Symmetry: C2
Subunit: 106 residues, 2 copies
């Protein structure tokens, strides 16, 4: 009546962060739940040409005795964009309440 | 391909450890209203973390992964008494819950 193992940091690093991608107004908008990071270690870029890849890293200490460890240390989210844009442009963003909002001109 | 359905099954990721006279539970739970976050102890040894939020994406949708309703069940290493003084903070999307060890019991309840 107990599972074999619990999801680990590795599992979440594989699938983190959850992202919504839609079109609203002028822009293509990307929204990511990315709690517990510092603004300076969050990165975004178009690569290969078609993709928006989001990257972030943080240190997580493992104090005292541990029972669960799931929170991702490193994040690498490859988002296949449906349209094209160069590899610069005005990709503007905000990071608030752990939510990363990326707006791309289009 | 992965959708809200899947993320609502595994979100939020949680660390849990025992430190300085507390059992500490830390959850990446970005983008919620603090007055909508709840935690409760069930059967003395399960901590339920629950939150709901509205999500409105206007135009076309290529990705819809962000959970709207979160219900995480965490099996605790011991039992929590009914009058335990549990506290919480929510910062930069991170939820930290602290349960005083003094508010717990090691014997399998009854």
């Amino acid at each position: 009546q107990k599972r074999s193992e619990e999801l680990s940091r590795g599992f979440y690093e594989l699938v983190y962060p959850p992202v919504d991608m839609y079109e609203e107004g002028g822009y293509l908008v990307v929204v990511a739940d990315l709690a517990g990071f510092n603004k300076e270690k969050i990165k975004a870029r178009v690569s290969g040409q078609n993709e928006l890849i989001i990257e972030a890293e943080r240190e997580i200490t493992e104090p005292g005795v541990k029972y669960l460890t799931q929170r991702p240390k490193y994040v690498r989210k490859v988002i296949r964009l449906p349209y094209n844009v160069a590899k610069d442009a005005e990709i503007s963003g905000k990071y608030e309440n752990g939510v990363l909002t990326i707006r791309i001109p289009i």
